[PDB]
Structure formats: C-alpha cells, structure tokens
Design a protein around this ligand. Structure first.
Ligand code: CL
Ligand code: ZN
Length: 269
C-alpha cells in the first residue's frame, strides 16, 4: 500500500501518484507532515507532539523575496539535504514524471509561502539545477492542489524567468510539463509577449533577450496567437497591433492576480 492521503497544516490532500516514502509509511491511512520543516510522520499522536515541539515557522534558507505577505525562500539542497528530500517526496505525490527525491545536492529549491501571524505557509515551489546542460531554468514546478488555479503557479513561472533575466540567460522548463504546466506556461508566455508587443519592430531574438524565454518557446506561443509567418525556412513575427490589443482585452489573457516585483527581489547570481 502506497501513501494516498497526507495531512499538512490544516489541509488533507489525496495523492495523485506513487511517491517512494519508506514502505512502513505507506502502510498508514494518512501521512502527517509538519508544514514548516516537512518532516513526515505516521500517526496523529506523533504529529501533535511535533507540532508543539517544532520551532520552525518558515522554510530554511534565504528569504530572497518579500512583497506584502508573499515570500520566496531559496534552499540549497546541499545545505539542507533532509528538508529537500522531504519536499521532493511530497512533490512526487502530485508530479508524475518527477524522478529525483534523495539525490538533492545538485538542486536549489524555491519555496513560495503566504505569511500570516503564525508563520510562512508553503503554497508551492520550483526546483532548478545549479548547472543545467540542457538550459533548464526549472526542473520541477508545482502548486499544492488546494492552491491551484489562483496565480501562484504563474507567479512561480514569472519568478523562474526573473532569476534567468538576472543571470542574463534564456531558459525553458524541463519537459514534460503536466497539463496544468502546459496551460500555465503558454498563458504566461502569451501575457508577457502580448504586453510587450503593445508598446515597434522587434526580432524574435530581441524578444528572447528581453524576456529570457527561449526562441522556440516564443515561436510556439506566437503561433498559437497567430502572430508568426513562415518565410523560406524562417519564422517571421507578423504582428497587427490591433490584434495585440484584441487579444489582451479578451478573457484568455490577463495580469495574474499576483505578480513578481523586480524591486522586491533580493537576489544576484
Ligand atoms: Cl484532495
Ligand atoms: Zn517541524
């Protein structure tokens, strides 16, 4: 028997996929997680004890972003092996194609939290290879189920590209994306490109430089917006500024409820 339900903070969440917690953890009805340190436990009694003993009120690592009550923590998987091993076992419950759980040192994880008087509550995260051969600025990304479809997912994507911009480099997420992944990325890419095309002759490589979105990713977005022509084996951006405004005004695209503010980011490569 696999883990199939978890209790974390005040949420219970059913699992979507196999996650390789040790066998005897699968045995239990629920898995109980500390919402701050992410320690997993077998019983409500050990959960309650931990709750009253644990001193953590936020993720480990560095708070590299604070705007209002949204915070992002940078955790190095080398400096915090166990926390990150726990994060990965948690994420694998909802990510089908996540492969890495124990070998965490090559990764740095970015933790989205919303803060109240009690502490900083994890809402989602994305991991990133420290050095990427394939040029992936995200390895895995995930908004926890009860928080999905509220702009946290898109905040994370936005954020992963803000980091790429400060590294003066283009990047694409590791594939395959989930269906929620695909939709959120195509939506983010769309909004970013449309917003910019509103404000005069920019090549696709010019757009790639400004946004840190790869040329393939810009091309495939522009195709779905119907703003790219094919000429002699070359993708040519063909934009009618009325159809740009047309698109924006529509329902499909809009400022996410919540956005990355480059000012409130305290990070450098
Ligand atoms: Cl659920
Ligand atoms: Zn704890």
């Amino acid at each position: 028997k696999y883990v199939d339900k978890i209790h974390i903070g005040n949420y219970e969440i059913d699992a979507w996929y196999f996650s390789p917690f040790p066998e005897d953890y699968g045995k239990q009805p629920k898995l109980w997680l500390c919402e701050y340190c992410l320690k997993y436990m077998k019983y409500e009694k050990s959960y309650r004890f931990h709750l009253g003993q644990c001193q953590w009120r936020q993720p480990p690592g560095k708070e590299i972003y604070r705007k209002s009550n949204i915070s992002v923590y940078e955790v190095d998987g080398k400096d915090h092996k166990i926390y990150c091993q726990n994060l990965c076992l948690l994420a694998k419950l909802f990510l089908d194609h996540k492969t890495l759980y124990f070998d965490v040192e090559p990764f740095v994880f970015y933790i989205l939290t919303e803060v109240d008087r009690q502490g900083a509550h994890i809402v989602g995260y994305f991991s990133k290879e420290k050095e990427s051969p394939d040029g992936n600025n995200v390895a895995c990304i995930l908004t926890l189920p009860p928080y999905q479809r509220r702009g946290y997912g898109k905040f994370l994507i936005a954020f992963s590209y803000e980091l790429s911009k400060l590294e003066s480099t283009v990047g694409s997420p590791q594939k395959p994306l989930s269906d929620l992944g695909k939709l959120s990325y195509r939506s983010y890419w769309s909004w970013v490109l449309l917003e910019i095309l509103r404000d005069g002759t920019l090549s696709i490589k010019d757009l790639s430089q400004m946004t840190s979105i790869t040329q393939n990713d810009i091309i495939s977005t522009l195709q779905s917006l119907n703003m790219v022509k094919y000429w002699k084996g070359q993708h040519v951006i063909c934009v009618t500024p009325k159809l740009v405004e047309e698109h924006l005004k529509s329902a499909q695209y809009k400022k996410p409820p919540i956005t990355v503010d480059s000012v409130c980011l305290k990070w450098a490569p």
